Amino acid sequence: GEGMWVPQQLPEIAGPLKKAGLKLSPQQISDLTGDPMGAVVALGGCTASFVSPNGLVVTNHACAYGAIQLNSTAENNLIKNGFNAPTTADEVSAGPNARVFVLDEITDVTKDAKAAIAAAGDDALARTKALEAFEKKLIADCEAEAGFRCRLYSFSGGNTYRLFKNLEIKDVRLAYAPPGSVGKFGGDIDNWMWPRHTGAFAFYRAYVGKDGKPAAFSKDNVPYQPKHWLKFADQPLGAGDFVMVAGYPGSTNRYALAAEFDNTAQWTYPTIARHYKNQIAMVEAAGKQNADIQVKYAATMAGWNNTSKNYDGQLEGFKRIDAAGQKLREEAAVLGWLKGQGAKGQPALDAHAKLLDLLEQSKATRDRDLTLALFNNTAMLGSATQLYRLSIEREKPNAERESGYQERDLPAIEGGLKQLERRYVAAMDRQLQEYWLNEYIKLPADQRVAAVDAWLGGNDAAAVKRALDRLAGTKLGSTEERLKWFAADRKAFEASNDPAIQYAVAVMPTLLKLEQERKTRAGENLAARPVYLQALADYKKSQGEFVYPDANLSLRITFGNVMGYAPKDGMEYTPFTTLEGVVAKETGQDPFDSPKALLDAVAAKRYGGLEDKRIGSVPVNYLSDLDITGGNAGSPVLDAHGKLVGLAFDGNWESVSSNWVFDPKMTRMIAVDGRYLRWIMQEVYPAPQLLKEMNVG
Amino acid sequence: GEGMWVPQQLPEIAGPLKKAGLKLSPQQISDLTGDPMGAVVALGGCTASFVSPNGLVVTNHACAYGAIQLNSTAENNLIKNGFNAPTTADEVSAGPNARVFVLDEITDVTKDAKAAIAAAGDDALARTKALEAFEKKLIADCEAEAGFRCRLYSFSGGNTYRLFKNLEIKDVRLAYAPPGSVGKFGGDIDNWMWPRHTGAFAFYRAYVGKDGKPAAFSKDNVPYQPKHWLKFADQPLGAGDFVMVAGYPGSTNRYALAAEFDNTAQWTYPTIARHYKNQIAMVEAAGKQNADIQVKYAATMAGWNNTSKNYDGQLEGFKRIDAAGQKLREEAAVLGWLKGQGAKGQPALDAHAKLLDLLEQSKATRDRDLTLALFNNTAMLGSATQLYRLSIEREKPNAERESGYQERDLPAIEGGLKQLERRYVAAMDRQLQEYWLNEYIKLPADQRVAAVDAWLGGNDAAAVKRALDRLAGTKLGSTEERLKWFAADRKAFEASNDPAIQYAVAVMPTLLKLEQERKTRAGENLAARPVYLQALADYKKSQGEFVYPDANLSLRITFGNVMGYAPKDGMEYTPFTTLEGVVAKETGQDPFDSPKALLDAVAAKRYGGLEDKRIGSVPVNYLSDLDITGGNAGSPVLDAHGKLVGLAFDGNWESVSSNWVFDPKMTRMIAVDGRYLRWIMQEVYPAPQLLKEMNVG
Amino acid sequence: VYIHPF
Amino acid sequence: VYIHPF
Ligand SMILES: [Zn+2]
Ligand SMILES: [Zn+2]
Ligand SMILES: [Zn+2]
Ligand SMILES: [Zn+2]
């Protein structure tokens, strides 16, 4: 059922967990560094879990897609072919920025955080800055022990703050990926849909130094030896059975003003989906004629397709449930309720009117803001802005440097510049620069940027042409030139004739003032959000509704049972798909082009000891009424005994709007069955070594 | 499950009936003129049943569609608005050709029939004529008792013959029809489809003379008092529950040569579907501008739509189950099995060869024969040819007149001529003539008919226009002119300057020769068909398969249980639909424009005492694994206690290919729930007088 | 609908 | 797929 419960809410959900079928004690689940919770890891944007005592980690294909792609070329395409390392020595680096985060400790720091906030007094910019300083100090302290990364999380509009401390494994290697026609069977046609038939899994191995401490990649590192790892279920998972997930959902917006919904629905999602679709169309066409462009842009293309389709889905789900109506109506209900308490509900009512005005202010510049941000995110402009800004920050003492430009951020910065080599082709990036310059000149007069207008010198195709021809002069297209500037000083940037660097230096003052404007807005939000959100939780409680904080990239537990759903009168989706359903979709064309070994195994009923008698085949994917979102891909699905029965990987089409208005009848997790992972690894793309390592071969 | 069982097979299915849940004794079902089997009537082309002791008859909306359409005008459109007679004197005539046939007696005449056939000797044409002569005598004898119509049926390729005698009620009146948006909710979009939400019902009342004897329409007639009528269930029908249907399925082709299947799939269905879709398009376009053409052609259009979609669905089902391959393999197995019997198999092997040759003969002229038949079935050419042929036949003694042109056929002929008044617009028929002239002109030289070529006197668009201009001078457009010619003699037709009559006179000798070819082929078929089909039956039984004759418009029983089906992996269709599903499909545009009273009643959850608590709503339609086909529309569905639980009205999309190769997993009946008939008549288009008459008020 | 073919 | 939005 509903709820992305924080682990501090386990007393509230102990009974419901029991009633739904959990056979472990809640005490055992509460042990976040214990068995099995302690085996669950964060990848940073996806979840994973340890599945052997030798540091073997399982996640989804889409979570490992970047790593797979980084290691792929046009002539050796691992996305297409899969990967299998017969021995740990054959494992390839998942990339310098790949991470495994193993939870160490959580601490409530709520009192101190809002003390530090209050001390800045009635000044918005100063309030943001006071929180920044407070967070940096806490993290510096927490990170004093080598090998740990810490993060401060704000829950429930800033009513609660927690600091998480994680072991940061920095040498992650790819151990296995099934062929793309299994890991991503159905491609973008089946994405966000049920029936689903996708082997959405892949494996990494976590490595540390010989002293057991974290370290960046070296052939001298060795597999990490985790305290806790998951075991595969020995009982067959069936319809109605208890399941739970623990993982790292990124964001939800279920506590939102109605106007924040309306903006998102009428502007944000249609605008971003359009832009994403145009870029997809350009890269698709270029890649049809250029296998290098096609491999190099594959991960970027997967993200554009995934988010644009998700937004189309949320738009359609809003209409299906009248989300716009429900938000309006429940807000009316809430505002009603506050004034009915007279003296008591004046603070909350004030907060609402403040939040509303903050929203109108961001709204005044949203076109400018988005377009500028996306233009500056093309590869050469992004590298130059980031590298120039770093050179500016490096002049300050480290504690005053902007988050993301501090010493602790250097590894990821340098890692990104390297990974870009496998994700950049000048001819293609030029087309994207062209796109965004065209979208920029389209902007109205108010909404323009001084500095970009001057740099461009004209509002027509001629200026665009000249701008493009100029930037093509940059030397930042090579990894080595990027790394040179990663070490260079500010003076050296401002001296450069490199036209990307010149662009960066030209716009940075504007970027810094826009960042001040954003930090000032966020400071006034910091006053007002926690009050109004606290009222919203209060109202919900008074209606007996479930109360848990929106997702924020921290660890959450969701539980329920395996079950289908009914999209329309006269029909039901069954809880499982089966092998036979994979082959029925076969076309011999991408994305429905399973390996021959799979087609042959299914025709011959080679079920590998994995058949579930209740469905007459090996299960492939299944539905359950868990409450997951972006970030949860890769999360292990545990049964009543805490055993691995699957991995979370997607949501059915009608679920996606639950990011804003939760709908229990149409909200289901799509999971890949543990037995299907095993099956692929026995019969289709074999990895007998990993099965043995997991005690299942 | 499978099987359109004849009543004489009851001993064989008594076990199965009991096992599936029938609580009546098999003896009680054996009495075809008792309770409840005596309540089941043929309309035919559809089935119906009595539901009150005062001659109320319930059937489907599609079955009463012609009747409703005959009583409709553009200004007063009963198809759209419904009809309801508050008292029996308000009932309107269903048309002179409407009929209720009540079963009186079935007699096996097999021995006699076969003796009459053998007496003809070696000549194919004589063999046809001998059987015709036998049939006419038998029927004349049977119909000596006034008020009765008799029909001779051949089963299993001529291995069995039975004579049916029916009471023939000739004054049928429309008592009630729901509005078209209930009767045909979802139109052609939902036709042949599940999920289904269609109130597929209507009521007639059967009338006889004051002397109790059948009579044509007169205000002195009174309601017929049936011996038996059905009663509505007092127990709620649920998933898994036993159901049975009795009715009059028209034709199936499960016993057929591979080649007959191949010709049908490759040429018959696609050809007919194309011609029908072309005519639809013209009439649809024309009716958009002229509401008189829209109403007058609506019943024709319903049939073109229904058959063309059916054929599309058969073509798709053949591909789904590889019907061509199944037919080929099954035939290779029968032909092997015959060869293996040496001497005694030879007659069937020989019969097969003769049947294949007869199909090839048919095939050589199929385009000519179809195109000519359909050109001549436009309204004025059809009237002229029929009437001119009648004039030819009237000069012979009655016993030698062609069936369809005997004295016993005059009422139907005359009634047809009158009904056409409500189904003909000159400017529309002209476009249909032009279509068929353009199709004629595409025929190759060796498929052309000298009489039509000469009459046309050209082969281009100019000639076509000249011919249409000539035909437009006919006077057969009026009912009175058609009846004048209904009574006129042959010489009067041959002297006429009416251009449609002239056409008929010119082509008649050619139609008569083609008829003789068909009669000749049919006589060879009479020799070969029984022998091969018996072998087919014998082979099926040696394989343990169900053995029952193809449908042939005679009374059959089918039984099974309420159940859904699974169209593909990860999905099931549920057995029922619900009221909320009807409203979920609302668009406010035909064919999804339910009456406002329906929309209101559902929104207010007014369930009228009819809620099935297991589905949380009033049920609308349901699925079952019964074996029905064209002709079964309107058949009562009975429960374990022989009570009415719905009416058969359609098949799901995948079921329609079962006319050639039966697929148990995807063949379901779609039926309208008795509760939904009652619900509509309570809350939406009320008929309290009818509900009271059926003891459900 | 299972009326007679047309 | 529930990767973190792009
Ligand atoms: Zn147990
Ligand atoms: Zn350089
Ligand atoms: Zn006249
Ligand atoms: Zn009973």
User: How many angstroms does the Cα of residue B302 sit away from the middle of ligand 1?
Assistant: 60
- Return the bridge partners of B337, or none: none
| Cβ pair A632, D2 in contact under 8 A | yes
Do A487 and A498 fall within a single domain?
Answer: yes
What span, in angstroms and rounded, lies between the C-alpha atoms of A601 and A617? 12
- Tokens for B696? 């459900």
Positive or negative: CA dihedral B447, B450, B452, B456: positive
Q: Which amino acid is at B198?
A: T
Q: Which method resolved this structure?
A: X-ray
B631/C1 Cβ within 8 A: no
CA B158 to mean position of chain CA atoms:
22
D-chain residues near A269 (CB < 8 A): none
Distances A484 to A506, A581, B217, B277 between C-alpha atoms, Å: 20, 53, 102, 71
Q: What is the dihedral of CA B185, B189, B195, B200, to 10 degrees?
A: 30
Instruction: Give the span between the Cα atoms of A341 and A344, in whole angstroms.
Output: 5
Q: Does residue B623 share a domain with residue B531?
A: no
Query: Under DSSP, is residue A477 helix (H, G, I), strand (E, B) or coil?
Result: coil
Distances (CA, A) of C1 to A600, B193, B652, C4: 41, 9, 10, 9
Among the bound ligands, name the one nearest to the CA of residue A476: 2
Q: Which of A569, A584, A621 sits opposite B568 (nearest CB)?
A: A584
Count of CA atoms in the C-beta half-sphere (13 A) of A471? 28
Extract the runs of DSSP E, i.e. beta strands, from B579-629.
Answer: 619-624
Contact at CB, A200 and D6, closer than 8 angstroms? no
Contacts of B578 in chain A (CB under 8 A): 569
Residue A93: which of A222, A177, A217, A203 has the closest Cα? Answer: A217
Q: Do residues B98 and B67 touch, judged by C-beta distance below 8 A?
A: yes
Size of chain A, expressed as the number of residues it contains: 697
> Which residues does residue B59 pair with via DSSP β-bridges, in sequence order?
B202
Residue of D nearest to A628 (CA): D2
For chain C, the distance separating the N- and C-terminal CA atoms, rounded to the nearest angstrom, is: 12
Cis (ω within 30 of 0) for the bond into B195?
yes
Q: Give 3-state DSSP helix, strand, coil % of chain C, rounded to 5.
A: 0, 0, 100
Whether the Cβ atoms of residue B685 and residue B84 lie closer than 8 Å to each other: yes
Q: Do C6 and B62 touch (CB under 8 A)?
A: no
Nearest to A647 by CA among A613, A672, A680, A623: A672
What H or E segment, with its residue span, contains residue B499?
helix B499-542
Beta bridge partners of A671: A622, A648
**Chain B residues with CB-CB distance to C2 below 8 A:** 628-633, 648-651
Kindly report the length of chain C: 6
Cα A541 from Cα A38, distance rounded (Å): 31
The CB density around residue B603, as the number of other CB atoms within 10 Å, is 11
Strands B171-177, B83-84: pairing is antiparallel
Residues of D in contact with A276 (CB under 8 A): 6
Tell whether B47 and B66 lie within a shared domain.
Answer: yes
DSSP state of A681: I
Handedness of CA B382, B386, B387, B388 (dihedral sign): positive
Q: CA-to-CA distance for B630 and B215, rounded, in angstroms?
A: 29
Token pair for A416: 């990104």
For residue B77 the two structure tokens come to 């459109």
Q: Residue B696: helix, strand or coil by DSSP?
A: coil
- Is there a single domain that holds both residue A119 and residue A47? yes
Tell me how many helices (H) and strands (E) chain A has. Answer: 27, 19
The rounded distance, in Å, linking the Cα atoms of B593 and A277 is: 36
Phi and psi, residue A447, nearest 5°:
95, -5
A514 and A565 both lie in a single domain: no
Closest residue by Cα to residue A3 from A516, A551, A525: A551
Residues of chain B positioned with their CB less than 8 A from the CB of A650: none
Closest residue to D3, CB basis, from A251, A304, A633: A633
Give the residue from B8, B661, B688 showing the smallest Cα distance to B322.
B661
Residues in chain B with CB shorter than 8 Å from the CB of A581 are 568-570
User: Which residue among A522, A549, A576 closes a domain?
Assistant: A549
- Please check whether residue A88 is in contact with residue A317, taking contact to mean a CB–CB distance below 8 angstroms: no
d(CA A530, CA A240): 39
At how many Å resolution was this determined? Answer: 1.8
H helices present in B265-406, as ranges: 269-288, 291-296, 298-321, 323-339, 346-364, 366-375, 379-394
Mapped onto helix, strand or coil, the DSSP state of residue B180 is helix
A132 and A17 in a single domain? The answer is yes
Give which of A613, A608, A619 is closest to A688, Cα–Cα.
Answer: A608
Beta-bridge partners for A571:
B573
Cα end-to-end span (Å), chain D: 12
**Would the CB atoms of A251 and D5 count as touching at under 8 Å?**
yes
Q: Are A381 and A433 in contact (CB under 8 A)?
A: yes
Q: Is B618 exposed, middle or buried (0-12, 13-18, 19+ CB in 10 A)?
A: buried
Residues of A at the D interface, defined by Cβ within 8 angstroms: 44-46, 60, 62-63, 191-192, 200, 250-251, 276, 303-304, 306-307, 310, 628-633, 648-651
Q: Are B295 and B77 in contact (CB under 8 A)?
A: yes
| SS3 label, residue B223 | strand
Instruction: Please list the residues that pair with B559 across neighbouring strands.
Output: B244
Where are the extended beta strands (E) located within B89-241? 92-93, 100-108, 148-155, 160-169, 171-177, 202-208, 222-223
Domain end (from B549, B570, B593) = B549
| C-alpha to C-alpha distance for A258 and A264, rounded to whole angstroms | 10
Q: From residue B581, give the alpha-carbon distance in Å to each of A99, A565, B186, B567, B578.
A: 49, 15, 12, 19, 5
**Residue A232 is part of which domain span?**
1-252+550-697
- Which amino acid does the sequence have at B513? K
Half-sphere exposure of A229 (CA within 13 A, CB side): 19
Burial A202-221 (b: 16+ CB within 10 A, else e): bbbbbbbbeeeebbebeeeb
Task: Quote the tokens at residue A629.
Answer: 């979102």
Distance CA B503, CA B375 (A): 12
Which residue of chain D comes nearest to A48, CA vs CA? Answer: D3
Tokens, residue B264: 């049908």
Give, in degrees to the nearest 5, the angle at Cα B236 between B235 and B239: 130
CB-based contacts of B538, cutoff 8 Å, min separation 6: none
Beta strands A40-42; B40-42: pairing state: unpaired
Q: How far apart are CA A88 and CA A520, in angstroms?
A: 50
Which tokens hold the place of A608?
Answer: 């590998």
From B184, which residue of chain C is nearest by alpha-carbon distance? C1
Which of C1, C5, C6 shows the shortest C-beta gap to B649? C1
Helices (H), B377-477: 379-394, 410-419, 426-442, 450-456, 461-471
- Distance from the Cα of A575 to chain D's closest Cα (Å) equals 18
Counting the structural domains of chain A, the total is 2
Assign residue B608 a region (left: φ > 0; alpha: ψ between -120 and 50; beta: otherwise). Answer: left
CA dihedral for B118, B121, B127, B132, sign (positive or negative): negative
Same domain, A509 and A559: no
Q: Which two tokens stand for residue A390?
A: 């770093």
Residues A570 and A543 placed together within one structural domain of the fold: no
Distance (angstroms) between ligand 2 centre and the Cα of A483 equals 10
Distance CA(B648)–CA(B673), nearest Å, equals: 9
How far is ligand 3, taken at its centre, from the CA of residue B502, in Å?
15
C-beta separation of B546 from B558 below 8 A: no
Structure tokens at A19: 């009633």
Q: Which of A131, A103, A129, A100 is nearest to A117 (CA)?
A: A131
Rounded distance between C-alpha atoms, residue B162 and residue A494, angstroms: 104
Q: Which of these, A14, A437, A36, lies nearest to A226 by C-alpha position?
A: A36
**DSSP annotation of B496:** -
What tokens does A321 get?
């449930």
- What is the separation, in whole angstroms, between the first and last Cα of chain B? 35
Q: In this structure, what token pair is assigned to residue A240?
A: 């109605």
Residues in chain D: 6
**Cβ–Cβ under 8 Å, residues B161 and B109:** yes
Distance, CA of B17 to CA of B640 (rounded, Å): 9
Give the CA angle between residues B302, B305, B307 to the nearest 5°.
105
Question: Length of chain B in residues, anyone?
Answer: 697
Q: How far apart are CA A111 and CA B283, in angstroms?
A: 78
CA-CA-CA-CA torsion sign (A131, A136, A141, A142): positive
Q: From B357, B345, B661, select the one nearest B531 (Cα to Cα).
A: B345
Do B635 and B579 fall into the same domain?
yes
- Which tokens is A260 given? 């924040």
Ligand 3: distance of its center to the CA of B484 in Å?
A: 7
Q: How far is the CA of B505 from the centre of ligand 3 (A)?
A: 18
d(CA B410, CA B415): 8
Interchain CB distance below 8 Å, B46 and C5: no
Distance CA A253, CA B539 (A): 68
Question: Could you tell me which of A550, A571, A546, A580 has the C-alpha nearest to residue A560?
Answer: A546
Q: Name the 3-class secondary structure at B569.
A: coil
Beta bridge partners of A463: none
For residues B492 and B630, state if they share a domain: no
Tell me how crowded residue B442 is: count the other CB atoms within 10 A of its CB. 9
Residue B105: strand pairing partners: B165
C-alpha distances out from residue B132 to A682, B127, B161, B510, Å: 70, 9, 13, 22
**8 Å CB contact of A651 and D2:** yes
Q: Contact B574/A571, CB-based, under 8 Å?
A: yes
Q: B620 to chain A: nearest residue by CA?
A: A570
Neighbour-count burial of B82, counting CB atoms closer than 10 A to its CB (0-12 exposed, 13-18 middle, 19+ buried): buried
Q: Which residues face B646 on adjacent strands? A: B637, B673
Cβ neighbours of D4 in A, within 8 Å: 44-46, 250, 630-631
Residue of C nearest to B45 (CA): C4
- Contact status, residue A658 vs residue A550, Cβ threshold 8 Å: no
Whole-angstrom Cα distance, residue B158 to residue B534? Answer: 9
Contact residues on chain B for C4, CB-CB shorter than 8 A: 44-46, 250, 630-631
Stated as kind and residue range, the H or E segment containing A63 is helix A61-70
**Measured between alpha carbons, how far is A138 from A148 in angstroms, rounded to an integer?**
13
- Sequence-distant (6+) residues with CB within 8 A of A89 are none
Helix (H, G, I), strand (E, B) or coil at A331: helix
Chain centroid to Cα A483, Å, comes to 27
Burial class (CB within 10 angstroms; exposed 0-12, middle 13-18, buried 19+) of B332: exposed
Same-domain check for residues A501 and A635: no
Query: Whole-angstrom Cα distance, residue B662 to residue B2?
Result: 8
Ligand nearest to the CA of A22: 1
Sorted by sequence, the CB contacts under 8 Å of residue B225 that are 6+ apart come out as B53, B54, B55
Joined together, the tokens standing for residue B339 give 């060869």
| Closest ligand to the CA of A496 | 2
* Buried-exposed string A505-528: b where 16+ CB fall within 10 A, e elsewhere: bebbeebeebeeeebbbbbbbbbb
Instruction: Quote the CA–CA distance of A113 and A97 in Å, as a whole number.
Output: 30
Closest CA to C6 of A62, B8, B307: B307
For residues A40 and A57, state if they share a domain: yes
Mutate to test the interface with B, among A197, A322, A571 (most CBs of B within 10 A): A571
Residue A605 DSSP label: T
The DSSP letter of residue A131 is H
- The span from the CA of A688 to the CA of A676, in Å, is 15
Contact, B40 vs B246, CB < 8 A? yes
A56 close to A690: Cβ distance less than 8 angstroms = yes
d(CA A197, CA A582): 6
Calculate how close chain B gets to C5, using CA atoms only, in Å.
Answer: 6
Q: Where do runs of H (alpha helix) occur along A143-268?
A: 180-183, 187-190, 258-263
List the end-to-end C-alpha distance of chain A, in Å, as a whole number: 35
Q: Which of left, alpha, beta for B545 (phi over 0: left; psi -120 to 50: alpha)?
A: beta
- Considering B491, B526, B549, which residue would you say is the last residue of a domain? B549
Neighbours of B275 (CB within 10 A): 18
- CB contact under 8 Å between B197 and A569, yes or no, is yes
Neighbours of chain B (3+ CB pairs under 8 A): A, C
Q: Which residues are A222's β-sheet partners?
A: A208
Q: How far is CA B381 from the centre of its chain?
A: 24
- Sort residue B631 into left (φ over 0), alpha (ψ -120 to 50) or beta: left
